[PDB]
């Protein structure tokens, strides 16, 4: 987990103030049709004769005034039935009822099936006459949006009776020093403060990392935080990398398929990526790389047109031995799939996905369901990090002891300024932290359903 977080950069803020950034997007639109009406305003049904026969006039109804006078607007069947805006829009409250005229030589009309709700219209041009031309056309604008993120705070403490000042240990059984990995190590330390100077650090950094990654939001949609501190003030938790990302571009499967995956990855690459730069590097657990292998096979196994020969594949290779002069080995594994375009699916298995302590749900096919999970973390290339862990300048963490006569954490042996008379010491540690993922849609994740709800 610590390596997973160190794969991300850090941003240093100035204070613990909610912050926001600007989100600027795309422009080109096309307007849906609400209704179409005859020469007499009678609305056209779907099972009806064509309209506009003989360049007759008719009305188009839209949810917006987006088109101007004298412009030529086209439907889904571009340029086959061209409509001319021969008159300003007469608004019915929010809908812009235009009057139109077919302007492409059309004589038979336009079928009542292309004048139905949903029909999308864009703008071609405003054509005018050579001589004595009058005014036509107009222009149009747009505007962007923004987003926000918050912070959070954590606290740890441990109290120690004062007699633990220079409290040697017999060391009958060896003393242990728990590690980050999970490994114990026999330690040679007589004083027991050595073994609390380690656990408070350990438990505290674990607090940070587990919150940084797997924190959730306590806030409502009205803006109210919902859990109230013992002091009475509300607790303001942020949200972790995973929660911030899985709000968008995240599928939940009960069955994996290279069919499903390539569709997802290709459709995305078409809508977002160039022909090149469609190289995806999926990150998964060992059980997924197996699951990938078996499915690439299920697929290639369907390539009944071709024939696969070990002369090029080498699934049966000659190995040296003594039981025979022609002794053979046998094995292979699929690790890529170049789908019909520059889309390319490589893999990168990381141990963070296989940990069975953090992960408690068990895939019935073996392991933890979190290894049967495929995450694309950086779609495309952004000029600046889409994911960064946030910290504050100078205001990061505070340490403090609330002790009486003896401070085993320091070896003071005498207190001028006592906190209390109970011959004990407490250590207090508080830290603030937060993380932001600017775009949740710039990360894909294919997740098993049992990891859901």
């Amino acid at each position: 987990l610590d390596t997973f977080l160190n794969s991300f950069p850090t941003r240093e803020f100035e204070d613990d103030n909610e912050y926001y950034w600007d989100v600027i997007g795309s422009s080109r639109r096309n307007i849906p049709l609400v209704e179409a009406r005859d020469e007499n305003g009678v609305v056209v049904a779907a099972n009806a004769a064509n309209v506009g026969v003989g360049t007759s006039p008719f009305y188009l109804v839209f949810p917006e005034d987006w088109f101007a006078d004298g412009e030529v607007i086209v439907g889904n069947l571009n340029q086959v039935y061209p409509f001319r805006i021969l008159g300003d829009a007469r608004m019915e409250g929010t809908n812009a009822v235009y009057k139109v005229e077919l302007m492409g030589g059309n004589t038979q009309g336009v079928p009542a099936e292309r004048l139905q709700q949903g029909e999308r219209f864009s703008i071609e041009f405003a054509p005018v006459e050579k001589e004595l031309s009058r005014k036509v056309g107009d222009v149009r604008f747009t505007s962007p949006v923004s987003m926000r993120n918050e912070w959070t705070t954590i606290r740890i403490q441990h109290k120690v009776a004062g007699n633990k000042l220079n409290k040697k240990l017999a060391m009958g059984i060896p003393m242990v020093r728990n590690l980050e990995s999970g490994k114990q190590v026999k330690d040679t330390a007589n004083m027991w403060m050595h073994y609390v100077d380690w656990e408070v650090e350990l438990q505290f950094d674990e607090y940070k990392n587990n919150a940084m990654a797997w924190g959730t939001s306590n806030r409502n949609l009205n803006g109210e935080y919902m859990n109230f501190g013992k002091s009475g003030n509300a607790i303001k938790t942020g949200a972790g990398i995973f929660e911030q990302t899985e709000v968008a571009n995240t599928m939940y499967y009960n069955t994996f398929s290279l069919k499903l995956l390539e569709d997802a990855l290709y459709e995305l690459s078409a809508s977002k990526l160039a022909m090149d730069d469609r190289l995806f590097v999926i990150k998964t657990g060992e059980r997924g790389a197996i699951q990938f292998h078996k499915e690439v096979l299920k697929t290639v196994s369907g390539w009944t047109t071709f024939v696969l020969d070990n002369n090029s594949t080498r699934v049966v290779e000659k190995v040296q031995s003594r039981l025979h002069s022609n002794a053979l080995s046998a094995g292979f594994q699929f690790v890529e799939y170049k789908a019909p375009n520059g889309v390319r699916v490589r893999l990168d298995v990381d141990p963070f996905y296989d940990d069975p302590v953090r992960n408690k749900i068990l895939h019935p096919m073996g392991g933890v369901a979190f290894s049967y999970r495929y995450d694309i973390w950086y779609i495309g290339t952004m000029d600046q990090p889409n994911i960064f862990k946030c910290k504050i300048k100078g205001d990061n963490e505070y340490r403090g002891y609330q002790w009486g006569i003896r401070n085993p954490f320091t070896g003071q042996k005498g207190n001028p300024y006592m906190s209390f008379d109970e011959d004990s010491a407490v250590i207090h540690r508080m830290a603030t932290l937060g993380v932001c993922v600017l775009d949740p849609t710039r990360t894909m994740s294919l997740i098993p359903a049992i990891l859901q709800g």
Binding site: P63, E64, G93, E246, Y252, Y253
Partner: protein
């Protein structure tokens, strides 16, 4: 929202209709005021702060005056009826991934070049009926679309037991197989959703979608497994959230354009539109023309709103008054 103006548009709410300028006590009262000559027309409205009157309409310079009904302004939610095409197979085909792709064109952006694809998967087994398949597919669709994690609502999945072809059995990521005890399910309806709205900052938009199917080998040939057909919508998004943003925009013409801008140094406008109601509308377009060289017109729009009880009682009496007062003959919807 922001709209296109023909040089101006004013809005006035008609909460109660009175017969005198003296009866205007409550902040939604309104009177259509005209003279016996039928030469001008104006409306006396009751505002949070005192009476106001609209610009005067020269009844000889009216271009059009049509009352729209509330039904006309409710966005119909397009819905498909998804099935499996009996040409490929009338029943599931075991071992095949019956995948379903749902495309979303106007996703967070507003362009058609800002697309978003969510999926639903079902792998079929022997003995699987069609109802069981639709059940499993709707469930996998909810878990991916109607989840508590997606930033936005996308679709409303439903189920229809052929015994009751009308009632649309709903489905959500919380719904589980056992909650669906029928065996005559015959389609997966997929309906667009009302997106979130906040007054004056998030216009009432929709994310349109088309269901795209995928291939399955049935007798050696890759074939599409289903057919998506649109059916007459049955759920409409009222205009409350729409008239409300109209007001928000058209009240900065009479009043303040600095809405909330310098937060403590602001003019707080009080609005009378309830975004949980259903209003008819009455738009009147007219112009002003000058004297002997300023013949250029200045077309100016004025629109009125009034709640709908289902029979348009409020607006009908409203215009019946305007017609008794101005000689016009607007049609009583």
């Amino acid at each position: 929202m922001v709209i296109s103006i023909n040089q101006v548009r004013q809005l006035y709410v008609a909460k109660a209709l009175k017969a005198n300028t003296a009866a205007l006590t409550t902040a939604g009262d309104i009177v259509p005021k005209a003279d016996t000559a039928k030469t001008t027309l104006y409306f006396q409205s009751m505002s949070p702060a005192g009476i106001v009157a609209s610009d005067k309409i020269n009844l000889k310079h009216v271009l059009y005056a049509k009352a729209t009904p509330s039904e006309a302004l409710a966005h119909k939610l397009v819905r498909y009826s998804v099935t499996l095409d009996a040409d490929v197979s009338a029943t599931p085909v075991a071992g095949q991934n019956y995948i379903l792709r749902l495309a979303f064109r106007q996703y967070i952006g507003l362009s058609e070049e800002d697309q978003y694809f969510k999926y639903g998967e079902v792998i079929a087994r022997s003995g699987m009926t069609a109802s069981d398949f639709y059940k499993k597919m709707a469930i996998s669709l909810a878990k991916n679309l109607e989840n508590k994690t997606e930033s936005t609502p996308l679709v409303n999945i439903y189920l229809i037991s052929a015994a009751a072809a009308s009632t649309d059995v709903p489905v959500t990521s919380a719904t589980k197989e056992s909650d669906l005890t029928a065996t005559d399910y015959n389609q997966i309806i997929i309906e667009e959703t009302e997106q979130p709205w906040v007054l004056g900052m998030m216009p009432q938009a929709f994310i349109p979608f088309t269901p795209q199917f995928l291939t399955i080998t049935v007798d050696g040939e890759d074939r599409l497994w289903g057919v998506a057909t649109v059916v007459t919508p049955t759920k409409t998004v009222p205009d409350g959230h729409l008239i409300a943003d109209l007001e928000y925009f058209c009240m900065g013409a009479r009043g303040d354009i600095y809405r909330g801008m310098g937060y403590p140094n602001i003019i707080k406008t009080t609005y009378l539109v309830d975004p949980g109601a259903v209003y008819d509308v009455l738009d009147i377009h007219y112009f002003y023309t000058g004297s002997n060289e300023s013949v250029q017109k200045s077309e100016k729009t004025i629109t009125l709103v009034a709640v709908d009880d289902g029979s348009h009682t409020a607006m009908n009496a409203l215009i019946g008054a305007i017609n008794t007062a101005s000689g016009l003959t607007i049609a009583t919807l």
